[PDB]
From a paper:
The suppression of caspase activity occurs in the presence of specific members of the IAP (Inhibitor of Apoptosis Proteins) family. In particular, cIAP1 and cIAP2 (cellular IAPs) are indirect inhibitors of caspases activity, whereas XIAP (X chromosome-linked Inhibitor of Apoptosis Protein) is able to directly inhibit both initiator and effector caspases. All IAPs host one to three BIR (Baculoviral IAP Repeat) domains that are critical for their anti-apoptotic activity. In particular, it has been shown that the XIAP-BIR2 domain is responsible for the inhibition of effector caspases, whereas XIAP-BIR3 directly binds to and inhibits initiator caspase-9, which can also be recognized by cIAP1-BIR3.
In the XIAP-BIR3 structure, ten molecules in the asymmetric unit are assembled into five dimers (AF, BG, CJ, DK, EL), each arranged around a local twofold axis, in head-to-tail fashion, stabilized by the bound divalent 9a (AF dimer). The divalent Smac-mimetic heads bind to both cIAP1-BIR3 and XIAP-BIR3 in the conserved IBM cleft, between the β3 strand and the α3 helix, roughly lined by residues Gly306, Arg/Thr308, Cys/Asp309, Glu/Lys311, Asp/Glu314, Glu/Gln319 and Trp323, in cIAP1/XIAP-BIR3, respectively. In both structures the two heads of the ligand adopt antiparallel orientations, with distances of 17.0 and 11.8 Å between the N1 atoms of their triazole rings, for cIAP1- and XIAP-BIR3, respectively. In the case of XIAP-BIR3, the 9a central phenyl ring, orthogonal to the dimer twofold axis, is hosted in a cleft between two BIR3 molecules surrounded by the N-terminal residues Asn249 and Pro251, and by the aromatic residues Trp323 and Tyr324. The interaction of 9a with XIAP-BIR3 N-terminal region promotes order in the N-terminal amino acids (248–253) that could be modelled in the electron density. Binding of the divalent compound to XIAP-BIR3 results in a crystal packing that differs from that observed in the crystal structures of the XIAP-BIR3 complexes with monovalent Smac-mimetic compounds known to date. In contrast, 9a induces the formation of BIR3 dimers, in head-to-tail fashion, with a buried surface of about 652 Å2. Such dimers, not considering the 9a contributions, are stabilized by salt bridges and H-bonds mainly involving N-terminal residues Ser246, Asp247, Arg248, Ser253, and Arg258, and C-terminal residues His346, Ser347, Glu349, and Glu350 (analysis performed using the program ‘PISA’). In fact, the higher affinity of XIAP-BIR3 for the bound ligand can be explained by the cooperation of two distinct contact interfaces, namely BIR3-BIR3 and BIR3-9a free head. Such hypothesis is supported by the existence of a larger interaction surface area for the XIAP-BIR3 dimer compared to cIAP1-BIR3, as assessed by the 'PISA' program (association interface areas of 652/459 Å2, and ΔGs of −6.9/−5.4 kcal/mol for XIAP/cIAP1-BIR3, respectively).
Numbering used by the authors:
A (entry chain A): 246 to 354
B (entry chain F): 248 to 352
The structure:
């Protein structure tokens, strides 16, 4: 189905990609300019069409990576409720990416 | 993009008062209640069923018949500060726990 609504429980949506090495493999043909090792470690595998990656745990998708963007920071911006993210980076990171993004908000606006 | 605001100050302070909002829905002709949407912070964008919350800047589209507008506001923009002020935290969480029940079917 790959429903739009992400997965903020602990059961990894696509469990067949819970392995790291299974993921960096999907970046075999990766031409885009974000670091693929930093990518997979952040929980992403490549969908093989364009630059679309999905997360293996929350099923969250990302596109149009601007060059040298951080997979980790990006993961937490759009899906602040991913359990594997919470596992890896811990709440403050998640609250920080958001806190700074709530800042260049009102900074002028 | 872009990033909806978890922040406390609204994004379109002009669509703050209810009366300004329902005015967008003067033409509105969809199977979703117009007077419910406006109550929920939303204003019509003119094109399609596309509506937007005045406070967070969330946009919702492809509406289905009888879909509760309050529910969706919570579903897609939980960090919305106006939503919170109108429904309390618990309500928002109920929607998320109910859709996490879906996650195992
Ligand atoms: Zn995730
Ligand atoms: Zn809102």
């Amino acid at each position: 189905s790959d429903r739009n609504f992400p997965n903020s429980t602990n059961l990894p949506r696509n469990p067949s990609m819970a392995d790291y090495e299974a993921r960096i493999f999907t970046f075999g043909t990766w031409i885009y300019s974000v670091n693929k090792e930093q990518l997979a470690r952040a929980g992403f595998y490549a969908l093989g069409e364009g630059d679309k990656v999905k997360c293996f745990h929350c099923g969250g998708g990302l596109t149009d990576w601007k060059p040298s963007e951080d997979p980790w920071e990006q993961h937490a911006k759009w899906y602040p409720g991913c359990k594997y993210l919470l596992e890896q980076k811990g709440q403050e990171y998640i609250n920080n990416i958001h806190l700074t993004h709530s800042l260049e908000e009102c900074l002028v606006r």
